[PDB]
Amino acid sequence: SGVSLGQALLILSVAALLGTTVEEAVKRALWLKTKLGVSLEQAARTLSVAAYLGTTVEEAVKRALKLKTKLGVSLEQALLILFAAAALGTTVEEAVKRALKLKTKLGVSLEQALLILWTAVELGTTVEEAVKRALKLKTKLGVSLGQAQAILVVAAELGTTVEEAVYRALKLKTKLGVSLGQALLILEVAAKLGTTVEEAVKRALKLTTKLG
């Protein structure tokens, strides 16, 4: 029970994505988190997958649950599938094949594999090249693969070099005393909101009750 800064930022991003007020975004998210008994993050993510698919939230969930039972995955994983497949513009079976192809090939989570696939979409590169870049960062900065891919996409959303992205991220981790995760989040949210980092955070803090 409580809103970590992280959750708050995401919800901002959702509010943005839906194009609703952040009061209504958070109302919907907290309503979904209880109705489904998921994390708040997962509730926001579900809102964002439904939007991404151009569907209603029930419809998305109904579909996820047909993939949860059919493939024996977790709900979130089912949502990720749907999202990945959308992004690609393929079928779920194809998406699922490619992801379990990356999962085995690289020794990662299914979730990681999907996200790699989605990063590739955004970067406009091959999945081989995306993994390349992510492994380059992982090593260069001693960061996790997740971080690496995150940085990549954030660098993309900003329309800046990965170097400059890191600079600003690190600069926000020093200036504000956040983790790298948080900084990246903040950067992307602010870019999606079309505001400063300071504005985005102040907005996030209005929702933050827990201490991330």
Residue numbers in the entry: -1 to 210
What does the report in the manuscript say about this coordinate set?
Here we address these limitations by introducing an artificial metathase—an artificial metalloenzyme designed for ring-closing metathesis—for whole-cell biocatalysis. Our approach integrates a tailored metal cofactor into a hyper-stable, de novo-designed protein. By combining computational design with genetic optimization, a binding affinity (KD ≤ 0.2 μM) between the protein scaffold and cofactor is achieved through supramolecular anchoring. From the catalyst perspective, we sought to address this challenge by designing a derivative of the Hoveyda–Grubbs catalyst (hereafter Ru1) that contains a polar motif, aimed at interacting via H-bonds with the protein, as well as improving the cofactor solubility in aqueous media.
For the fifth round, we screened a fragment shuffling library (540 colonies) by randomly recombining the beneficial mutations from third and fourth rounds. The X-ray structure of Ru1·R5-ΔHis displays close structural similarity to Ru1·R0-ΔHis, with a backbone ΔHis of 0.6 Å and a Ru atom deviation of 1.0 Å between the two structures. Notably, compared with Ru1·R0-ΔHis, the evolved variant Ru1·R5-ΔHis features an expanded and less hydrophilic channel leading to the active site, which results from the three critical E4G, E144G and E179G mutations. These probably contribute to the increased affinity of dnTRP_R5-ΔHis (versus dnTRP_R0-ΔHis) and hinder the approach of hydrophilic species (including GSH, OH− and so on) that lead to cofactor inhibition. Yet, the resulting models did not accurately reflect the deeper placement of the Ru1 cofactor as observed in the crystal structure. In contrast to the free cofactor Ru1, the dnTRP-ΔHis host protein protects the thiophilic Ru1 cofactor from poisoning by GSH: at [GSH] = 1.28 mM, Ru1·R5-ΔHis maintains > 20% of its RCM activity, whereas Ru1 is completely inactivated at [GSH] ≥ 40 μM.
